[PDB]
Symmetry: D3
Subunit: 139 residues, 6 copies
């Protein structure tokens, strides 16, 4: 059954938006099957953002995801990857539709509160990267 | 500084109240310094409820608490143990005041949505039981 | 099992509080087993308020209660009568506790947004008065 | 003055979404002029869904609207038919815009929480089908 | 740093929507740097709506913004003019996207709850018109 | 008729709680008859807190209250002073009941989010201190 990775970023955590974000996913009927508050190491951040490593300001992108506690989480349900992407909305919070997490809360592209996997492929990669098998919980 | 332990129980998880509960702690200004979704083992459930092990409802407690995922968490702030207990309210949701978590959501004395340490000592025992030091996160 | 009667009064209806009120009962885990929007007749209003028919505010009660649509409802669950009364709070919203329906929304002793049966007997009388058996719905 | 028919489906009712849905319509300024909790008979369901009778899985569509209590309701206000359609959003909750009832709550096309009339024509037909004249209330 | 003018119109004020509107802007991370409850004079209304003076029903447009207290306010933050325009949504509340203030609350074009500046140019004009320099507050 | 004074303090402003606070007063049915964002001057802060000027925390009070913008407001309605005090709750948020403003949001006795007049006399003094007559708005 389909799963996606979500990270509540340090700005989401620091601004007290964790409950609000989770409620949106629970109201929508998804299952949290893994979740933890953590601090992301340098290495892990670079691995996570590997496809961005030759892009402008890579290190400001990394610096920021290591600048505070995040909530790492795996959601399960039908069309979860795609549905979570639409609930989160466009990377740029000015362009993200109203009613999306980024349209309603995000302050800028760099401070856009939350990440969700792009694709089936990147969900599987991000889930394996952040969680061991034993951290997944059945329900 | 002062820390308390909170558990969103399987009824709170299964009913989609994780976010709402977390939001009350965030709006209150507390800092989540550790958090995880988990399944509680038989042994962990018995150590946690050790004081009630001679009571005739002990199997009802244990079977319930290990029946689905819970969210375990550590909260930090001034008077956190006392303040969190007041926010959660009386064990029996029928007696819990309106505006408490148990008063607004609990459905029975056993299905009361959430637990919070009841003293300084209980908070130290419970945090030690549920978390290793490495799962604690400085902001 | 145990049932109580609830009426969202014409002020609650006219101010747009039906959903909010219903949501508190749903988040609390009660089952709505009968519900309807209605206009209360003169006769129904007098039978309902029969005990106050010698009081000098009786015309104020009756004219108010039959002045716009109400929502009549039957709620079911453990301790529902007592729990619903506590959720609704004291008759005079000035005395009702914060977090109650009357404490959060009521504007005067007469415009107090909502009624809930005050005992087992009162709940049986009121349900009988407002609903025929065929309007009861098993889940 | 324009009216539309809304049905909160059994999944909306069973998941405790009745207040939330009603609040969205009351915040938007519409009047509930009829409402009831009911169970839909086989006959009524088939009549309601008559235009679908030669389409795939008709009977799964019927089976489901009879599988639990629904809330039947008539809303009144300007552009109500069309405005309610946009508030409810696309039949498919994956495609329904964020901020719509189906985008925020719906789990699938079959479990999409709510129905609202398509057209002036089908509102008039659905209202007559579910309500007698005396169940409409003036305000 | 960019600023925009917002007016909560008399219908928004009269329907108790002031907190809700402000919360949407605070959740989005904007700063209120000026705000007041006031009554708009005839002169000020005509000046405010000067570009509409040769359009149909100008005086009904004016009559209405003078028919009750409004909240005048200046918001500051990045892309504030444009982001506030999208949060408020299309002038016509039937066409305004769900999740926008006008899509969720507005009853009609004339009763559309709220105004926000069109452009950098009209923000500067509307701010100067409603506020003296000393009413702006630094933070 | 009866009026009280309310101040959303700099913690309430800086944390993004203005709307939420205002919404509780609006849902309660009170009329805002004057309101403004302001910076409080040293002198205004000392006159307001005159009774505490010999207490060792007086500098902590004054420095805090003049440390960022506040929202000053006048609310009108039956029993407004008493009712608003109950809604706000006890000075020390640890003692304030759940469902109060201070109980749900206050983080310390000094950072308690909000002030409301404590008597009829105090309300007259405070309204006089913070507002000129011309800032009062009849609905």
């Amino acid at each position: 059954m389909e799963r996606t990775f979500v990270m509540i970023k340090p700005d989401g955590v620091q601004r007290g938006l964790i409950g609000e974000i989770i409620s949106r996913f629970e109201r929508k009927g998804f299952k949290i099957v893994a979740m933890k508050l953590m601090r992301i190491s340098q290495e892990l951040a670079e691995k996570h953002y590997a496809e961005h490593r030759e892009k402008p300001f890579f290190s400001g992108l990394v610096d920021f995801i290591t600048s505070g506690p995040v909530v790492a989480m795996v959601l399960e349900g039908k069309n979860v990857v795609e549905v979570v992407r639409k609930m989160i909305g466009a990377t740029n919070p000015k362009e993200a539709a109203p009613g999306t997490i980024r349209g309603d809360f995000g302050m800028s592209v760099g401070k856009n509160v939350i990440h969700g996997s792009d694709s089936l492929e990147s969900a599987e990669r991000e889930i394996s990267l952040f969680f061991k098998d034993e951290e997944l919980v059945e329900w």
